[PDB]
């Protein structure tokens with residue numbers, strides 16, 4: 001029983017637009033912040049790589065559907081490129097080519113019995129909107145609503161699973177470093193918090209828009225995808241446990257407390273620590289933006305499920321480190337990783353499968369057991385089809401998730417592997433491979449070929465259980 005997926009549980013795979021599509025300036029698509037970063041700042045990216053072509057999924061979407069069908073995916077999570085649909089960011093111009101492209105992909109998926117799950121925003125902001133300041137500028141919340149309206153109107157008759165945003169914990173960090181994630185702006189502890197504030201507002205507007213303009217007719221569900229690492233106390237002390245709770249609230253709670261709790265607002269520890277630190281450093285005003293009571297009420301409850309992106313764990317101990325000002329310093333935890341944990345091809349990613357079960361329980365307890373859809377989980381290597389590390393990563397994480405479901409009563413409703421195929425891994429270029437399908441980036445045809453992990457995942461999806469040879 002503990003090895004069997006619930007009957008209604010949805011299994012599949014995931015991608016994101018900039019990471020796979022290419023066709024960066026084709027047929028009316030406007031420029032986004034990742035076009036800008038990779039073109040203007042190739043020194044920020046391994047190999048000076050760009051997403052100009054990537055997997056060429058703009059042209060090769062039928063091949064993506066073919067491999068999803070081979071895999072036996074029930075659901076395909078993909079993102080829509082804002083600047084492909086609205087090249088100017090604002091909704092004055094709708095690019096029919098972009099509408100046609102996503103309709104073509106959606107229709108191809110449905111014709112092959114695969115359900116689309118659409119992420120509206122997976123990091124590729126139109127440059128025209130970044131030029132207003134991007135996410136720190138609250139005007140983007142209305143722009144986001146208008147973008148979502150176009151998506152719901154055009155695609156919502158066939159798409160019943162939506163994520164407003166993918167992992168704003170990461171993309172807010174594009175406003176906390178001059179050399180990091182797009183748009184690579186150095187306003188740590190200030191602009192990243194403003195970005196988070198706008199995103200939360202935007203998410204809430206999009207959810208209310210769905211309620212007001214689309215839900216009665218379309219009958220779908222709207223969530224948000226949040227990335228969170230498990231944070232394990234470095235020792236069993238109360239003080240180290242406090243530091244790990246700080247971590248959860250500063251990383252997951254920053255977004256999830258306003259939306260998924262009955263109280264709403266930011267977590268108290270976030271408000272209080274930032275207020276204190278801001279005062280001690282001489283600011284008249286806290287660096288953390290505030291919600292009014294009306295805004296708190298508007299934002300809380302804006303969810304039909306919680307998307308979780310889970311990859312790894314950290315150790316946390318009591319203390320403070322990091323630069324002043326910064327979110328890490330404000331969070332009041334000292335983070336490390338255990339040397340004993342198995343490694344990947346990504347410095348940040350260690351294999352800690354039991355951390356997944358711990359995190360699912362933390363979420364259950366904090367947010368009253370919301371329906372949780374695992375929108376990303378996966379593992380990097382540098383190449384190869386006999387990807388034993390990836391196979392082990394998936395079988396262990398899926399076992400831990402199944403224990404969370406069956407033993408712990410966590411309402412997990414679906415799981416999409418990150419990623420369907422090797423793709424453009426942001427600042428790591430094509431150097432780190434997360435796919436279950438390999439892609440030859442030196443071959444203009446970009447063939448997708450199954451790794452051992454794709455074969456094992458297909459077996460899991462077909463049998464709806466963890467095969468005996470992978471059980472404890």
Ligand SMILES: O=S(=O)(O)CCCN1CCN(CCO[C@@H]2O[C@H](CO)[C@@H](O)[C@H](O)[C@H]2O)CC1
Pocket residue numbers: 016019166167170227309311347348376418425434
């Ligand atoms: O090495 S450093 O410590 O100097 C920088 C680390 C930056 N992290 C990397 C991991 N990412 C996880 C969630 O982000 C996910 O990560 C996947 C794999 O990376 C991406 O492909 C997906 O687009 C994304 O949603 C959050 C940001």
Ligand SMILES: [Cl-]
Pocket residue numbers: 468469
């Ligand atoms: Cl066997």
Ligand code: NA
Pocket residue numbers: 094150153154
């Ligand atoms: Na339209």
